[PDB]
RNA sequence: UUGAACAGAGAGCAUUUCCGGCAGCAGAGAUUUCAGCUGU
């Protein structure tokens, strides 16, 4: 009779030399591993609880802030850690966000500096030294656009006349500014929107639809010759710089405070307006928004895109900011602070990992876009654990017990009470429109994505 | 764990190697448990290059068994499926992992290079170029890697431009060992010899000289002298003029012994103008070396170079027609030397007589030669 | 059991492998360590009787404060427990809830009586001596540690005659009279 | 982008290749500041690609004086020309991380396609490789680095003071 | 890609008894591709499996397998396995209930009299020998060799690694059967009271008290698949219990008389129950069919056990008898005791042994080795059973070579991923799904408006009333069943219009009868 | 902004241009592997 038993042999399972690790034999039988749904449910629940205890999003404020509340912010789209901010008392500052300290400050204007951006100024007589000088220009309500250079310690190649290399001049005030991402060009909105270049001391072209003023401006990031602007007649106007002309405008219900273009989709933009939500619009069809981001409770002051194009940040007049996944339409996250008042400017840093907010008490604050995410480099075991936990929270996302935990935040008292009376108001109007629809004959079902456009020039067929 | 990743990367080749009916499941489980042992020893702690080497030897043995079993079972020499390159690719990756972990044993680096070269048509010479590039980056001072790199790319591929670039970069890195200098003058003489032999061959079927070798000879003398005077008397120059002249004399002895070796292994290149190419080293050594090699000490070296300049046409066989042509040149050399020297006169006379007697009916013409050099 | 890190101790706070809430702080173990109680179930056998006394004391304090039934039975139970020795004072009736206690019933055990009468240097020595059969109450030898000694019955706790311990204390003071064997 | 790293040391020169960038904006945070103390995470940032050792204490003292007064020596020229790719001089230079802001100009004087960075990111990368030292080099140098440090410090000091033994 | 052993690694799913969305269509196509890739690559690991299972095979027709002696096995197998086949002769305390740790490293024996010993049976290291002089009944380890629970005269006690008493449980009044649920950290307790108690060992909290309502618990086993408890009563009834429902999940009528023993396969598919009516019965668990009914055993089977490789070890007093491939569907796998004339279609015993002196107390297979530990009246005996253990364990579920640091970290990690006691269901894959209420099509709010519309117009359309139909034998007409199931004294508008539509139906049936 | 020749990198993308078929033969290195001509 032949016969054979289990010969475990102890050389394959506990190692000979003491310096090396023990063997881990695997056996992928589901008989060996029994509770495959419950075990990863509890791992997804422990991941959501670990996220809710690791959510420490406030990095730090930078510097000492300003004196009179930050109303303009501009990142530069080529360096990771440099940031220009301007306040109401005319002072602008250039910031190193690594050390959280200003390269330089500038008493730029006398009024409010109402816009500022950054440039690589293509002069055709001089050569731009972009490895030691940074350039920011800035418009105010004292009818001036000024262009400044900054001494920057980022390369150590060299070894110098920092401020105010030139002063463009308008006859009326300015209200917004944004620079083209090539070809020495910028545009300033104000009493009317002008286009400029850094060589000529006068506007190249006036590109105004009608005699109604312009409140904001953004250039496109790819297809760089497409401008967009917000006018105080609740209007959003697109301009093209091939045709050197406006292109199409829409009139909404309330006033668009800001625009930002999608850096990864080149025809989509997001508007941030005074009814308390944001609108994701396609340039090729402005007859309908392709999303509405709804969760704010007062007027949305500024919006910005992640450089990955996958989520937006959105600061509003209720003293809180909100981060939104672009495909959803409700807030993924809310950041607030008892010290932060009336966040007027929000940018999304080029790392896609930090969020810069300028409030109006004076302070500019860094936040993490993902609160539970730390910024060290990770060994492969902890990196694998973190993305395993992300995939697991993703596929158990809608279970009631982990949804009530991942959904949870502490919102201030004012925003919570405005939220619940907003809920009972919306439920009341849905009740009344359901009754009215039960009776009356032809009540059209208007979409939420169309419920906020009062009209559109150049009708669609 | 990463042993799990590597072990389940090993499974498609044995899928294919069981489907092609040469191995069975019970023997491929045995090669997997041996390979499990080896992968765990590789990527655990306390690892060794001998663990890498034994894994490479085991994988080569199962490759040879796979080839033998293929020829015996399927009676083809390759199944043109996955299981005839996957195992050599595995050996190449074990080598790459080992050289990334322990980049310090040139035995393992050279086993990598030998296996990669001997893989044949299936490898790529740019794949050999990559591991030559990273090995020369890690060991720039080790000079045999520069010689081996340039030897592979001249004695196999015949790439003169890249070979010149390799030798110039190596001489940029360590311009201190004379071995790289000698292999560079050897390469330049081999290149110019192949150039003039392809000229002779195109003539026989149907300007650019050894002055390259003389110029690199000149910079060889200059930089080897500079590096020996900088190497010895190391920290400072705190040494009085006795020790400075002692040092400078010794560097002249060092450099001139290396040029003696240069002419000694220079004579065997006799397909170019060997007389001109040795006489230019003679005239480059004949000049002043700033510490009176002729007019003071190293007079033995002056006598050695005088004997070389005398026999520089008499480098001949026992058929001594050149001696019967220009032995009066050697007599005038001995007369011009003994017109000045005192004991080197008798030394050079006895040495030239002993050299001509040792090197040179046939004894009757040799009796004429003995009467001449008596 | 491995001194959890901060995220683990925050994530599983109620985990404890030793101290549970049904344990009641290990007080059976605590007072049986104090009074050196052999078997595990003596604490709970005494706890049943303390619960009887306190259940009757509750249900008897829930009577009206002036009737002679309540006053007679409260005084009668108070007298019985003082005479037995569990209660140390028969004055106030709040002793029938507060001062009635397994430790009081355990202080009345034979080795504790012994140790307080200076008859052994510790309670474990007293346990060893009455296990070895040196101690008699009255005439008859008492052999087990759990024997409860009332107030009038602690006057007769002595050693047996022909005890080696009795012999060595008498011969320490050299009052040993070998006529009566010690 | 901090693509390559140049660490000078008494045994020779080392060129490292930066694998993963550390954070720029979160560079003052606690986890970013102590990942350069943990070795298991620093080896995720820095990889050694080249180490040219010196010819002896004489060339060590020569290169110590050249590194001290901010000049590119010939061994520096050799190792940088071996290791750094031939980038452009007008568009996207290759980025070398040094620790000496007045050695940078001497590096761009010799290689115009190299922009040099010594700010706080390059400083803590450099002090990470200083903190770990012999572990990064994988066993490829002769001579213990602290023994060569003792010899080079004594030689540098006696040179700088002109210590005569007469 | 084909993988001859995929259906072990396959995973069942929900079925209804395709889409127009482009993004959802491609998402489901990616999900099906990933499921197929994952099943195939997970099933290709059987190359990487290190060891092979044991066996013994007859190689002749005169050589039967049940007549192979244990000394002959110990001569035929190696010295390490022959030394694992231990035998402790502990005569003075009672019959020894045996228990192994879930990796086979530690052994826990209990004498009936008082002698409980936890030990490393394969080294010679005992780490607790405590003589608790009241009659102990059973014990089990909790999550380790570091804690064990013993069921004493009445109360269940919990002891640490070296044997100091940690806990006396004031509940668990008379346990006779303890079993630990290791993924849920639950000590389960049943006995002479008709109560089943689940006690959380980690928090310390009594999770559940359930009335069995069927007298004392005669047998008890745990499904390793879904952690439901099969208790066997004096009715001949097995009942499957969970700590959520205060009623048994299922009640099966296994035997006549009482139920002496229950064992469950580790795949959670088969259950062998022995009754006191001399009847072994093999049960399907998932579909609750009765697979085999071996009636008229020569003496009642006092124990059953099922190995990790599916052997069936029945014990009838002095005798232990093991059958191979008995837990299968076909009638040729019914375990016989002889093959009448050499029938190959009769499952004769795989091996048998006779403990001639005594009567065995319990059976337990050693987890990852080829041994069967039977505890009997004079101590412990391991039997070398060659087909009887998973040769290839997973070393990150539970490791027989695990060290002290690995024990510490695995204890903290399994404590962290402890499953809640509410997730115990009859099937484990029912905690990701949706309700079996809450309609299987998701609703798009147009139909919610439509549902509220017909809820407004339930009156005057009678959509909440049975429809009028005359030809349906009006003694069972639906409308009169409404009228009779309602309470016959209240009057609401719903039942008024049912009475109206019923009179309409009666008049239509009257005129149809008249024209017929 | 384009064009030109030059110097290259291994860091991308095709496709039927050949080879990973067989001998005869000489050559190469330490009895195994390596290197080209005339046809299948």
UniProtKB/Swiss-Prot annotation, chain B:
Residue windows of the HAT repeats: 86-118, 123-155, 158-190
GO CC, any one term: nucleoplasm
InterPro entries: HAT, TPR-like_helical_dom_sf, Utp6, UTP6_N
A Pfam entry, by short name: HAT_PRP39_N
SMART domains assigned: HAT
GO BP of this protein: endonucleolytic cleavage in 5'-ETS of tricistronic rRNA transcript (SSU-rRNA, 5.8S rRNA, LSU-rRNA); endonucleolytic cleavage in ITS1 to separate SSU-rRNA from 5.8S rRNA and LSU-rRNA from tricistronic rRNA transcript (SSU-rRNA, 5.8S rRNA, LSU-rRNA); endonucleolytic cleavage to generate mature 5'-end of SSU-rRNA from (SSU-rRNA, 5.8S rRNA, LSU-rRNA); maturation of SSU-rRNA; maturation of SSU-rRNA from tricistronic rRNA transcript (SSU-rRNA, 5.8S rRNA, LSU-rRNA)
The keyword Ribonucleoprotein is annotated on this UniProt entry: yes
Keywords: Nucleus, Repeat, Ribonucleoprotein, Ribosome biogenesis, rRNA processing
UniProt GO molecular function: identical protein binding; snoRNA binding; U3 snoRNA binding
Domain of life of the organism encoding this protein: Eukaryota
Cell compartments where the protein resides: Nucleus, Nucleolus
Similarity remark: Belongs to the UTP6 family.
Note from the entry: Present with 7520 molecules/cell in log phase SD medium.
Assembly and binders: Component of the ribosomal small subunit (SSU) processome, or 90S pre-ribosomal particle, composed of the 35S pre-rRNA precursor, the U3 snoRNA, and at least 40 protein subunits. Component of the PWP2/UTP-B subcomplex composed of DIP2, PWP2, UTP6, UTP13, UTP18 and UTP21. Interacts with U3 snoRNA. Interacts with MPP10.
Protein name: U3 small nucleolar RNA-associated protein 6
Source organism per UniProt: Saccharomyces cerevisiae (strain ATCC 204508 / S288c)
UniProtKB/Swiss-Prot annotation, chain C:
Subunit field text: Component of a heterotrimeric complex containing IMP3, IMP4 and MPP10. Interacts with MPP10. Component of the ribosomal small subunit (SSU) processome composed of at least 40 protein subunits and snoRNA U3.
CDD domains the UniProt entry points to: S4
This protein's UniProt keywords: Nucleus, Ribonucleoprotein, Ribosome biogenesis, RNA-binding, rRNA processing, rRNA-binding
A GO term for molecular function: snoRNA binding
Main location: nucleus
Domain of life assignment: Eukaryota
Cellular location(s): Nucleus, Nucleolus
Keyword Nucleus: yes
Gene: IMP3
One Pfam family this sequence matches: Ribosomal_S4
Position of the signal peptide: none
Similarity comment: family membership: Belongs to the universal ribosomal protein uS4 family.
A GO term from the CC aspect: 90S preribosome
Name this protein carries in UniProt: U3 small nucleolar ribonucleoprotein protein IMP3
GO biological process annotation, one example: ribosomal small subunit biogenesis
Domain S4 RNA-binding: 108-174
Protein's job: Required for the early cleavages at sites A0, A1 and A2 during 18S ribosomal pre-RNA processing.
Curated annotation (Swiss-Prot), chain D:
Record localization: Nucleus, Nucleolus
Disulfide bonds: none
Functional summary from the UniProt entry: Required for 60S ribosomal subunit synthesis.
Record-stated family: Belongs to the NOP5/NOP56 family.
Further remark: Present with 13500 molecules/cell in log phase SD medium.
Oligomer status and interactors: Interacts with NOP1 and NOP58. Component of the ribosomal small subunit (SSU) processome composed of at least 40 protein subunits and snoRNA U3.
Protein name: Nucleolar protein 56
Species of origin: Saccharomyces cerevisiae (strain ATCC 204508 / S288c) (Baker's yeast)
Name of the encoding gene: NOP56
From Swiss-Prot, chain E:
GO biological process: endonucleolytic cleavage in 5'-ETS of tricistronic rRNA transcript (SSU-rRNA, 5.8S rRNA, LSU-rRNA); endonucleolytic cleavage in ITS1 to separate SSU-rRNA from 5.8S rRNA and LSU-rRNA from tricistronic rRNA transcript (SSU-rRNA, 5.8S rRNA, LSU-rRNA); endonucleolytic cleavage to generate mature 5'-end of SSU-rRNA from (SSU-rRNA, 5.8S rRNA, LSU-rRNA); maturation of SSU-rRNA; maturation of SSU-rRNA from tricistronic rRNA transcript (SSU-rRNA, 5.8S rRNA, LSU-rRNA)
Summary of subunit composition and partner proteins: Interacts with snoRNA U3. Interacts with MPP10. Component of the ribosomal small subunit (SSU) processome composed of at least 40 protein subunits and snoRNA U3.
SMART domains given in the database record: BING4CT, WD40
Superkingdom field: Eukaryota
Pfam families: BING4CT, WD40
Keywords on record: Nucleus, Repeat, Ribonucleoprotein, Ribosome biogenesis, rRNA processing, WD repeat
Region (Disordered), start-end ranges: 457-478
Role: Involved in nucleolar processing of pre-18S ribosomal RNA.
Residue spans of biased composition, Basic and acidic residues class: 1-11
Cellular component GO terms, alphabetical: 90S preribosome; nucleolus; nucleoplasm; preribosome, small subunit precursor; small-subunit processome
Subcellular location: Nucleus, Nucleolus
Extra remark beyond the main annotation: Present with 5800 molecules/cell in log phase SD medium.
Gene transcribed to yield this protein: UTP7
Protein name as catalogued: U3 small nucleolar RNA-associated protein 7
Repeat region (WD), residues: 90-131, 212-251, 254-293, 296-333
């Amino acid at each position: 009779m032949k016969i054979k038993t289990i010969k475990r042999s102890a050389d394959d399972y506990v190692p000979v030399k003491s310096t090396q690790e023990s063997q881990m034999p695997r056996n992928l039988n589901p008989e060996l591993h029994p509770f495959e749904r419950a075990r990863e449910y509890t791992k997804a629940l422990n991941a959501t609880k670990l996220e809710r205890m690791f959510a420490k999003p406030f990095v730090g404020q930078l510097g000492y802030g300003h004196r009179d509340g930050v109303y303009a912010i501009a990142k530069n789209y080529g360096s990771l850690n440099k940031l220009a901010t301007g306040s109401a008392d005319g002072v602008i500052k250039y910031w190193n966000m690594s050390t959280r300290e200003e390269f330089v400050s500038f008493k730029a204007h006398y009024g409010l500096v109402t816009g500022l951006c950054v440039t690589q100024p293509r002069f055709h007589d001089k050569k731009p030294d972009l490895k030691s000088q940074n350039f920011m220009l800035s418009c105010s309500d004292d009818k001036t656009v000024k262009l400044w250079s900054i001494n920057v310690d980022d390369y150590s190649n060299k070894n110098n006349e920092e401020g105010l290399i030139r002063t463009f001049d308008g006859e009326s005030a300015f209200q917004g500014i944004d620079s083209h991402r090539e070809n020495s060009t910028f545009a300033t909105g104000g009493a009317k929107i002008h286009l400029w270049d850094v060589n000529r001391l006068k506007p190249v072209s006036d590109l105004s639809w009608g005699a109604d003023n312009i409140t904001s401006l953004k250039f496109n990031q790819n297809e760089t010759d497409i401008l967009a602007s917000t006018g105080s007649d609740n209007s959003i106007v697109l301009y093209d710089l091939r045709t050197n002309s406006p292109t199409q405008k829409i009139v909404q219900t309330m006033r668009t405070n800001a625009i930002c273009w999608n850096p990864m989709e080149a025809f989509n933009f997001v508007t941030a307006n005074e009814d308390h939500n944001a609108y994701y619009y396609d340039m090729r069809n402005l007859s309908r928004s392709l999303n509405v981001f709804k969760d704010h409770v007062s007027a949305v002051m500024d919006v910005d895109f992640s450089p990955t194009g996958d989520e937006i940040v959105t600061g509003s007049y209720d003293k809180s900011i909100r981060i939104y996944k672009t495909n959803h339409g409700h807030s993924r996250e809310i950041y607030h602070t008892k010290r932060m008042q009336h966040v007027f400017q929000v940018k999304y840093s080029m790392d896609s990992k930090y969020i810069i907010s300028g409030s109006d008490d004076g302070n500019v604050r860094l936040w993490r876009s993902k609160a539970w995410e730390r910024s060290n480099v990770k060994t492969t075991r902890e990196k694998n654990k973190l993305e395993y936990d992300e995939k697991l929270k993703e596929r158990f996302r809608h279970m009631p017990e982990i949804k009530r935990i991942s959904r949870h935040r502490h919102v201030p008292q004012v925003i919570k009470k405005a939220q619940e009376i907003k809920n009972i108001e919306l439920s009341s109007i849905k009740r009344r429109e359901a009754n009215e629809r039960r009776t009356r004959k032809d009540m059209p079902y208007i979409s939420e994505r169309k419920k906020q456009i009062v009209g559109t020039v150049h009708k669609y067929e | 764990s990463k042993t799990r990743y590597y072990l389940e990367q090993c499974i498609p080749e044995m899928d294919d190697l069981v489907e092609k009916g040469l191995f069975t499941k019970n023997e491929v489980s045995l090669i997997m448990k041996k390979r499990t042992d080896f992968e765990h020893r590789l990527n655990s702690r306390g690892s060794s290059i001998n663990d890498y080497i034994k894994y490479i030897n085991y994988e080569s043995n199962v490759n040879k068994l796979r080839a033998k079993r293929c020829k015996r079972i399927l009676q083809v020499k390759k199944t043109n499926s996955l299981s005839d390159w996957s195992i050599q690719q595995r050996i190449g990756f074990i080598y790459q992992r080992g050289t990334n972990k322990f980049p310090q044993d040139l035995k393992f680096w050279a086993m990598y290079l030998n296996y990669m070269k001997a893989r044949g048509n299936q490898t790529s010479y740019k794949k050999i170029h990559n591991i030559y590039n990273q090995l020369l980056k890690l060991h720039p001072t080790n000079v045999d890697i520069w010689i081996s790199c340039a030897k592979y790319e001249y004695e196999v591929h015949a790439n003169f431009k890249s070979c010149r670039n390799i030798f110039q970069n190596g001489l940029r890195f360590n311009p201190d060992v004379p071995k790289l200098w000698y292999e560079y003058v050897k390469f330049e003489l081999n290149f110019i010899t192949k150039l003039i032999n392809r000229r002779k061959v195109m003539g026989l079927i149907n300007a650019l000289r050894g002055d390259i070798a003389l110029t690199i000879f000149d910079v060889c003398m200059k930089t080897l002298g500079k590096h020996y005077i900088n190497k010895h008397k190391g920290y400072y120059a705190i040494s009085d003029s006795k020790m400075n002249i002692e040092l400078n004399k010794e560097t002249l002895n060092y450099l001139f012994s290396e040029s003696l070796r240069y002419i000694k292994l220079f004579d065997e290149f006799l397909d170019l103008e060997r007389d001109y190419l040795i006489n230019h080293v003679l005239q480059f050594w004949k000049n002043d070396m700033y510490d009176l090699s002729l007019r003071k000490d190293l007079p033995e070296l002056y006598l050695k170079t005088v004997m070389i300049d005398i026999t520089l046409n008499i480098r001949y066989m026992p058929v001594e027609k050149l001696d019967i042509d220009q032995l009066q040149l050697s007599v005038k050399k001995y007369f011009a030397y003994i017109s000045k020297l005192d004991s080197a006169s008798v030394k050079s006379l006895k040495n030239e007589y002993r050299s001509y007697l040792q090197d040179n009916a046939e004894d009757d013409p040799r009796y004429k030669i003995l009467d001449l050099i008596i | 059991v491995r001194k959890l890190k901060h995220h683990e101790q925050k994530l599983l706070k109620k985990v404890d492998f030793l101290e549970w809430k049904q344990d009641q702080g290990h007080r059976d173990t605590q007072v049986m360590r104090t009074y050196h109680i052999q078997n595990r179930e003596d604490y709970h056998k005494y706890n049943r009787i303390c619960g009887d006394i306190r259940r009757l004391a509750n249900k008897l304090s829930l009577l009206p404060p002036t009737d002679p039934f309540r006053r007679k039975h409260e005084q009668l139970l108070l007298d019985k427990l003082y005479a037995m020795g569990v209660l140390t004072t028969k004055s106030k009736i709040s002793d029938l809830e507060n001062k009635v206690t397994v430790s009081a019933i355990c202080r009345r055990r034979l080795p504790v009586i012994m140790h307080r009468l200076k008859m052994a240097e510790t309670i474990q020595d007293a346990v060893k001596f009455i296990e070895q059969g040196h101690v008699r109450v009255g005439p008859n030898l008492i052999n087990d540690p759990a024997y409860l000694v009332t107030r009038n019955m602690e006057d007769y706790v002595t050693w047996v005659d022909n005890s080696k311990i009795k012999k060595t204390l008498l011969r320490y003071r050299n009052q040993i009279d070998d006529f009566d064997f010690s | 982008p901090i693509e390559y790293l140049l660490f000078e040391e008494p045994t020779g020169y080392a060129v490292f290749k930066v694998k993963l960038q550390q954070d720029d904006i979160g560079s003052r945070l606690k986890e970013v500041q102590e990942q350069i103390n943990d070795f298991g995470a620093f080896t995720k940032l820095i990889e050694l690609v080249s180490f040219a050792p010196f010819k002896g204490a004489a060339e060590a003292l020569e290169n110590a004086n050249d590194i001290s007064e901010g000049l590119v020596s010939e061994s520096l020229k050799a190792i940088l020309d071996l290791n750094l790719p031939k980038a452009s001089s007008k568009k996207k230079n290759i980025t070398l991380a040094i620790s000496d802001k007045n050695l940078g100009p001497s590096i761009k004087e010799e290689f115009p396609y190299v922009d040099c960075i010594s700010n706080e990111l390059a400083q803590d990368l450099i002090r990470g490789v200083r903190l770990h030292g012999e572990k990064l080099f994988k066993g490829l140098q002769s001579g213990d680095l602290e023994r060569a440090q003792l010899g080079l410090g004594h030689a540098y000091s006696r040179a700088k003071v002109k210590f005569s033994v007469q | 890609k084909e993988r001859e052993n995929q259906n072990k690694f396959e995973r069942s799913t929900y079925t209804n008894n395709q889409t127009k969305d482009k993004k959802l269509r491609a998402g489901l196509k990616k999900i099906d591709e990933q499921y197929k890739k994952a099943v195939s690559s997970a099933a290709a690991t059987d190359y990487l499996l290190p060891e092979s299972n044991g066996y013994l095979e007859p190689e002749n027709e005169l050589e039967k397998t049940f007549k192979v002696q244990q000394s002959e096995i110990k001569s035929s197998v190696d010295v390490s396995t022959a030394n694992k086949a231990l035998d402790l002769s502990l005569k003075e305390f009672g019959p020894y209930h045996i228990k192994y740790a879930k990796n086979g490293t530690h052994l826990l024996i209990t004498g009936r009299k008082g002698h409980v010993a936890s030990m490393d049976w394969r080294k010679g290291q005992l780490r607790a020998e405590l003589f608790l002089n009241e009659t102990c009944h059973s014990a089990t380890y909790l999550q380790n060799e570091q804690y064990f629970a013993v069921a004493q005269k009445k109360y269940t006690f919990i002891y640490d690694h070296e044997g100091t008493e940690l806990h006396r449980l004031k509940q668990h009044i008379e346990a006779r059967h303890l079993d630990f649920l290791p993924y849920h950290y639950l000590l389960v307790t049943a006995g002479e009271t008709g109560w089943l108690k689940y006690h959380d060992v980690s928090t310390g909290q009594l999770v559940s008290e359930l009335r069995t309502k069927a007298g004392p618990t005669m047998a008890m086993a745990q499904n390793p698949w879904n952690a439901v408890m099969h208790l066997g009563h004096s009715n001949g009834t097995v009942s499957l219990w969970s700590p959520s429902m205060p009623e048994p999940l299922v009640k099966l009528l296994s035997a006549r008389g009482p139920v002496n023993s229950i064992a469950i396969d580790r795949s959670g598919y088969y259950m062998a129950t022995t009754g006191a009516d001399r009847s072994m019965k093999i049960w399907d668990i998932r579909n609750f069919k009765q697979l085999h009914s071996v009636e008229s055993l020569p003496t009642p089977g006092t124990n059953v056990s099922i190995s990790d490789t599916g052997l069936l070890a029945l014990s009838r007093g002095p005798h232990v008898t093991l059958w191979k491939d008995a837990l299968k569907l076909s009638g040729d796998s019914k375990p016989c005791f002889g093959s009448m004339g050499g029938n190959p279609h009769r499952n004769t015993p795989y091996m048998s042994h006779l403990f001639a002196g005594n009567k065995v107390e319990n059976l337990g297979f050693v987890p990852f080795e080829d041994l069967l530990g039977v505890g009997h009246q004079t101590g412990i005996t391991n039997l070398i059973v060659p087909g009887a253990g998973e040769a290839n364990y997973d070393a990150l579920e539970l490791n027989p070579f695990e060290t002290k640091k690995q024990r510490q970290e695995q204890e903290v990690r399994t404590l962290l991923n402890k499953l809640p006691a509410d997730t115990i269901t009859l099937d484990p894959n029912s905690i990701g799904s949706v309700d079996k209420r809450s309609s299987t099509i998701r609703l798009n709010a147009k139909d919610l408006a439509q549902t509220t519309m017909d809820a407004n117009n339930k009156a005057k359309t009678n959509s909440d009333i049975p429809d009028v139909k005359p030809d349906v034998k009006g003694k069972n007409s639906g409308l009169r069943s409404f009228l009779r199931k309602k309470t016959q004294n209240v009057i609401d508008e719903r039942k008024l219009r049912v009475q109206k539509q019923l009179d309409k139906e009666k008049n239509i049936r009257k005129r149809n009868h008249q024209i017929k």
